Design an enzyme around this catalytic site. Structure first.
Site, PDB file in Angstrom:
ATOM      1  N   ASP A  56      12.463   0.811   5.145  1.00 56.66           N
ATOM      2  CA  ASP A  56      12.969   0.252   3.895  1.00 56.66           C
ATOM      3  C   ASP A  56      12.396  -1.137   3.643  1.00 56.66           C
ATOM      4  O   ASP A  56      12.877  -2.118   4.203  1.00 56.66           O
ATOM      5  CB  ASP A  56      14.496   0.178   3.939  1.00 56.66           C
ATOM      6  CG  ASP A  56      15.091  -0.343   2.650  1.00 56.66           C
ATOM      7  OD1 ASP A  56      14.345  -0.429   1.653  1.00 56.66           O
ATOM      8  OD2 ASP A  56      16.309  -0.674   2.650  1.00 56.66           O
ATOM      9  N   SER A  74       3.988  -6.837 -12.164  1.00 56.85           N
ATOM     10  CA  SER A  74       3.084  -5.889 -12.776  1.00 56.85           C
ATOM     11  C   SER A  74       2.593  -6.420 -14.109  1.00 56.85           C
ATOM     12  O   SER A  74       3.301  -7.145 -14.801  1.00 56.85           O
ATOM     13  CB  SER A  74       3.790  -4.542 -12.936  1.00 56.85           C
ATOM     14  OG  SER A  74       3.025  -3.638 -13.702  1.00 56.85           O
TER      15      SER A  74
END
Ligand SMILES: CN(C)c1cccc(C(=O)NN)c1
Length: 330
Positions: free
Chosen positions: A35, A199
Site C-alpha cells: 500500500d 498530473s
C-alpha cells in the site's frame, strides 16, 4: 541488494493485489497488500481476536526465534474506506522477493474491522508511503522500504500491476524490459506523507487533451481512480445510460456498454487507461448495472490515482533525497 516479488489480484475484478512476504525465523509467509498510501506493516496474528479471523494466515511471533516484543509500542490505523485495525508491535526479520530487512517493525493486530475479517485473501498490509505516516506510538517506526533503502542498489521501488493478471514489485532496480518508451519523472510533495504529484491533464476516449493540473496521490492500496467531479462527469457523459447513483455510492453504467479509454498526463507524456480497466462489474450479483472504475473524489478531500490508473503504467517510486515519481507505458 535488490528484491523482486510477484503481486497477484485477489479476485476477478482486481480489487486489490497480494504479495508474499516472509516474516520471522523460520519464515512465516503471509500475503500482504502493498500500500503506497499508508506506512504501517501490520499482520493478522496469533494475538488477533479469534472471532475476527476467518481464513487468513497468521503470524505467530512466539514461533519466530528472531521476534522481539517492542516494549510499550502500540498502533492503530484507519483507512480511507473506513476500515481499521490496531494492536502491539514486534521487530523481526522481513523478506520480500529475496530482499531482507532485519529489525523491521511488524505490527501485530489485536483487532481488525469487519472488512478485513471478511476478506480471507489479505493477511495484512505492507505500507510504502513515507514513514511520517506510521502510526506506532510512542516511537514511530520506519517502513520496509525506508529500512531497506541504504542497502538497495538504487533507492527505488517499482509497481507493475497487472490487469486481470499477476504483476511485479521490484526493490532497488528498474527493469528496463518491463516498459515501453521512456519513463517520465514528475515532482513529489511529501508534505502529507504520500506520493503526491500533479498530473498535467486528461482526455476521454479519442477526445482532445485538456491541460489542467490535478494534484493527487499514487496509491496502490486504493482500487479505483478518484478525480474531481468535473473530470468524472466528462468521462461518464460519454457512456450512454451512465449516471451517478447515491444509493449505490457512485457512477454506474449499463453492463452492455463499451467503455471509452481515459488518458492522464504525466508532464508532456500520456498514460492511457483502456476502457475495460474501468469496468468493475455488476453492482450486485446478476445485475445489469455495472460499477464504474472512475469516481468522484469530492467526498474524500484528495484525488487518488489508485490501481485503475497505476496498472496502466510501469511506476517508479524514487526514494532519493528528493523523491520523485516516474511513469512509463507498458
Ligand atoms: C484520509 N485517509 C486516511 C486516507 C487518504 C488517502 C489514502 C488513504 C489510504 O489508506 N490509502 N491506501 C487514506
Amino acid at each position: 541488494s535488490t528484491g523482486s516479488a510477484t503481486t497477484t489480484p485477489i479476485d476477478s475484478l482486481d480489487d486489490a493485489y497480494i504479495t508474499p512476504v516472509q516474516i520471522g525465523t523460520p519464515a512465516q509467509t503471509l500475503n500482504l497488500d502493498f500500500d503506497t498510501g499508508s506506512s504501517d506493516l501490520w499482520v493478522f496474528s496469533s494475538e488477533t481476536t479469534a472471532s475476527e479471523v476467518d481464513g487468513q494466515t497468521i503470524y505467530t511471533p512466539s514461533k519466530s526465534t528472531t521476534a522481539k516484543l517492542l516494549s510499550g509500542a502500540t498502533w492503530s490505523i484507519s483507512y480511507g474506506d473506513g476500515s481499521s485495525s490496531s494492536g502491539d508491535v514486534y521487530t523481526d526479520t522481513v523478506s520480500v522477493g529475496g530482499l531482507t530487512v532485519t529489525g523491521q517493525a511488524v505490527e501485530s493486530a489485536k483487532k481488525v474491522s469487519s472488512s478485513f475479517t471478511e476478506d480471507s485473501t489479505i493477511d495484512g498490509l505492507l505500507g510504502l508511503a513515507f514513514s511520517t505516516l506510521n502510526t506506532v506510538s510512542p516511537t514511530q517506526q520506519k517502513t520496509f522500504f525506508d529500512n531497506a533503502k541504504a542497502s538497495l542498489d538504487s533507492p527505488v521501488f517499482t509497481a507493475d500491476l497487472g490487469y486481470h493478471a499477476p504483476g511485479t514489485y521490484n526493490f532497488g532496480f528498474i527493469d528496463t524490459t518491463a516498459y515501453t518508451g521512456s519513463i517520465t519523472y514528475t515532482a513529489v510533495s511529501t508534505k502529507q506523507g504520500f506520493w503526491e504529484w500533479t498530473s498535467t491533464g486528461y482526455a476521454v476516449g479519442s477526445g482532445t487533451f485538456k491541460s489542467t493540473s490535478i494534484d493527487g496521490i499514487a496509491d496502490t492500496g486504493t482500487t479505483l481512480l478518484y478525480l474531481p467531479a468535473t473530470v468524472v462527469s466528462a468521462y461518464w457523459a460519454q457512456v450512454s445510460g451512465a449516471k451517478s447513483s447515491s444509493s449505490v455510492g457512485g457512477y454506474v453504467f449499463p453492463c452492455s456498454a463499451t467503455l471509452p479509454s481515459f488518458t492522464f498526463g504525466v508532464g508532456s507524456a500520456r498514460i492511457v487507461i483502456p476502457g475495460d480497466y474501468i469496468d468493475f462489474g455488476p453492482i450486485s450479483t446478476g445485475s445489469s448495472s455495472c460499477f464504474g472504475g472512475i469516481q468522484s473524489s469530492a467526498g474524500i478531500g484528495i484525488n487518488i490515482f489508485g490501481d485503475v490508473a497505476l496498472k496502466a503504467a510501469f511506476v517508479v517510486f524514487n526514494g532519493a533525497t528528493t523523491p520523485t515519481l516516474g511513469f512509463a507505458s507498458k
